[PDB]
Design a binder for this molecule. Structure first.
Ligand SMILES: [Cu+2]
Ligand SMILES: [Cu+2]
Ligand SMILES: [Zn+2]
Ligand SMILES: [Zn+2]
Lengths: 153, 153
């Protein structure tokens, strides 16, 4: 898959469309798009294991983590594959997302296709917060909106 | 993936949740579940190509057809990989689904993971409807509800 897409929808204001592009299977993938209805500031943004939205964002499970690593930030080695960090929402509550990541992929074992993109209530502390939650979730709070990552063109 | 799920939802009442299970990579996918809000009778059931929902069901594109054959029903040679036939809606408008299929898959070129499951307005003439549209859609009409097929536990 050179391209994927996810429509984030939630039980509330937050919604947005996020796009993933991988030009070759070994390449970095770029994730760009808009999330709306956020509060201003930092919000955790991750790919969660399951593409299951039967119980909303809660059925997606924990961060996608094929390597059984601990939680980190995108630049950390000790991170989970789905740790894309934070995205910032401006004053109008809008996140113009722009991330480039080389751990996640749209093909093979680290494929994020069919899994869930989630945008969180609070900032992800990037595993630097010094308590067990930090290394699990990054203390990023609830899942405001989520969507299953699907194949695009 | 041994399991997958699609939460079927659209612009009106028609909604449902369809599960997929494939016990070995080279064996059949069991699909099962219920849709609701359907008019009594038969409804086209197909996996469309893209799991792109930016435009609702409209952006999902054509029937997933990796080997370029023409539209058929689940049991034809000349079928498209996404051609899963028709579900039947009872007088309360609930359609229960049990399908075992050997052409779709949850792994490899035929993988329906990350693509869009669509329940249609009208019935699929199984491609044997005799006309140029029949050989593309089976005349199933509007996309009433759809979901991107995600990986499940
Ligand atoms: Cu998360
Ligand atoms: Cu169709
Ligand atoms: Zn994580
Ligand atoms: Zn077809």
């Amino acid at each position: 898959a050179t391209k994927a897409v996810a429509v984030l929808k939630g039980d509330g204001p937050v919604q947005g469309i996020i796009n993933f592009e991988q030009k070759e299977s070994n390449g970095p993938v770029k994730v760009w798009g808009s999330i709306k209805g956020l509060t201003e500031g930092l919000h955790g943004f991750h790919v969660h294991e399951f593409g299951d939205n039967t119980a909303g964002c809660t059925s997606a499970g924990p961060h996608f983590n094929p390597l059984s690593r601990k939680h980190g930030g995108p630049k950390d080695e000790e991170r989970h594959v789905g740790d894309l960090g934070n995205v910032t929402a401006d004053k109008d509550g809008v996140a113009d997302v722009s991330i480039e990541d080389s751990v996640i992929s749209l093909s093979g074992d680290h494929s994020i296709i069919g899994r869930t993109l989630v945008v969180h209530e609070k900032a992800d502390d990037l595993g630097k917060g010094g308590n067990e939650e930090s290394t699990k979730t990054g203390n990023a709070g609830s899942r405001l909106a989520c969507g299953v990552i699907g194949i695009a063109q």
